[PDB]
Structures are given as C-alpha cells and as structure tokens.
C-alpha cells in the first residue's frame with residue numbers, strides 16, 4: 001500500500017559556490033556516492049570499480065559487493081559542453097533521502113581528468129526528462145513518480161552561499177528556505193527544464209535577449225551561461241576581461257557593478273554584483289572572478305542561456321512535473 005504523502009529532504013554540501021552535492025546509496029548493502037542533482041541531464045551515473053585518471057580520486061561502484069545488482073552491459077556515452085563520460089548500463093537499488101528505487105544507471109569506466117579532477121563529487125543524478133535520457137533509460141524521478149509515494153510530483157532546490165550547503169526536497173518545497181510566494185513559468189515544452197526569457201537587462205536598460213531567448217534552469221551548472229555573442233556584449237557592459245579561464249574585474253570595481261535582471265514570466269529576477277562577483281578582495285591591485293561564462297549549448301537544447309547555481313542561490317527553485325512549470329521564490 002502506497003500513499004502519495006512523502007516529502008524527502010537531501011542535505012547538500014556547497015563546495016566553493018560551484019559544486020552542490022548530496023549523497024545517494026547504490027546496491028545491497030548500500031554503496032554511498034557524492035552526486036550533483038542535475039536538471040540539465042537525464043541519466044544517473046557513478047564511477048565503476050571496472051574503471052582504468054579521475055577514477056583514482058573518487059568512490060567506485062562495485063557490482064560484486066551488491067546482492068541486488070542486475071547486469072545489463074549496454075555501452076553508454078554521455079556528452080556535454082562541460083564534459084564527456086563513458087561506460088556501461090547496470091541496474092540496482094538507489095536510495096535518495098528515504099526513497100528507494102530500482103534504477104538503470106551508468107557504471108562509468110572513462111572519466112577524463114579535465115574536468116573530473118576538479119570534481120569534489122563522484123557522480124551525477126540527472127533530474128531531466130526521458131526525452132533527453134541517453135539510451136532511453138527511465139530517469140530516476142520518473143521511477144519515483146511511478147511509485148506513488150510523493151506528496152506532489154515536484155522537486156525543489158535550495159543553494160546556500162558558502163552551515164547547510166543546500167537542500168533538495170523531493171515531493172515539495174521547504175518554506176524555511178524561501179520567502180514570499182512562488183511565481184511560475186510554464187515550460188516551452190515538456191522534455192526539457194527550459195522556459196522563455198523576454199530580456200536580459202544590465203542596469204535599467206534592456207541590453208540583451210531583446211527579441212526573446214531561452215533559459216535552461218540547470219542545477220548542475222555552476223554559473224549563469226549565455227552564448228558567446230550574448231556574453232561578449234555583457235562582459236563589455238561590465239568592463240570585464242578574459243583571463244585564462246574566467247572573466248575578471250578589478251576587485252575595487254566589483255561592488256559598483258550594475259544589477260543584471262532576467263525577465264521571466266511576468267517578473268524581473270535581479271542579481272546584484274554581490275550575487276555574481278566572487279568578491280574575495282576589495283583591493284584595486286587584485287582581480288575578482290564573475291560567476292558568468294559563455295557556453296554555446298548545441299541543438300536541441302541550445303542556443304540557450306543556462307541559469308545555474310549563480311541564479312539558484314538567489315532564487316529557491318521548484319521543478320513541477322505534474323504542471324510542466326518552474327517556480328521561483330526569493331531564497332533565505
């Protein structure tokens with residue numbers, strides 16, 4: 001007998017405002033993994049004991065220590081703008097919070113040092129739709145919905161500033177982590193956590209996305225990202241400069257930087273300089289990083305902006321599967 005009355009919370013660790021990860025258990029007895037809960041991907045994967053560079057520094061799933069394991073073996077490749085992993089399919093029981101689900105997942109045998117050496121987590125729990133799942137593997141949240149345990153077919157994200165690192169709620173939202181009410185925006189289409197964006201303002205003027213654009217709400221992305229063209233105009237308006245990997249401003253100029261507003265649904269979602277500048281110094285002789293970068297996301301998802309951790313820290317986000325919508329409320 002299953003009742004639709006469960007809301008399960010998962011505590012997240014915040015690593016340097018760029019990586020938010022929690023724990024999942026795989027197998028019998030459970031093998032624990034640190035995972036990023038990512039709305040921009042639809043597959044579950046962890047490094048495998050069968051792995052070979054980055055595998056030496058992470059926890060590895062050993063199917064031979066699990067009584068609940070079911071062999072599959074189908075080859076799996078997950079390719080993204082952030083990185084590419086490869087491996088094979090396996091089935092086992094996955095526990096997330098208090099929910100236990102039989103899940104088809106990827107045992108990763110190919111983990112490149114770039115960017116996986118920089119990862120403090122072991123794997124990724126894809127929070128996206130089946131439409132974007134590689135190998136048409138049923139995503140974890142669809143398997144949780146099938147169970148009929150959830151109070152609501154929603155999941156929410158709280159990302160704290162770098163003390164609770166963050167929290168994911170399965171089956172609802174935590175009113176202790178937001179203020180006021182949620183404002184909802186319907187998805188353009190089911191299959192992707194993406195909504196229409198009406199404009200991007202720098203200061204009081206609509207400088208970008210003037211004829212509208214797309215916004216992927218991506219929990220696994222560290223930063224806000226835009227296309228090369230959009231980011232070039234944004235960075236020139238901020239007076240930011242491209243160093244080796246990131247855009248920087250002179251630390252003394254950081255607090256004076258203009259507000260950046262994203263016009264979504266019938267509301268402006270504003271990030272002040274404090275929300276997007278890693279203000280590690282106030283010195284005129286030091287360089288301060290911006291939590292914004294360019295990413296040319298390929299079709300079908302892109303060209304699109306991606307609202308990552310930079311955005312989520314400011315706005316508590318609810319991903320609603322029953323109504324195909326995303327809700328935002330000011331985080332606390």
Ligand SMILES: c1ccc([C@H]2CCNC[C@@H]2OCc2ccc3ccccc3c2)cc1
Nearest residue numbers: 040041080082083115116118119124220221
């Ligand atoms: C495998 C690779 C990349 C991703 C993307 C898919 C779109 N959303 C962002 C995710 O990146 C998560 C991620 C992956 C590697 C990382 C390595 C270092 C730091 C952060 C990292 C974050 C999912 C699975």
Ligand SMILES: *[C@@H]1O[C@H](CO)[C@@H](O)[C@H](O)[C@H]1NC(C)=O
Nearest residue numbers: 071072073074089104136137
């Ligand atoms: C692996 O699982 C998929 C279901 O997602 C199935 O279609 C496929 O035939 C399985 N392969 C093996 C070898 O069991």
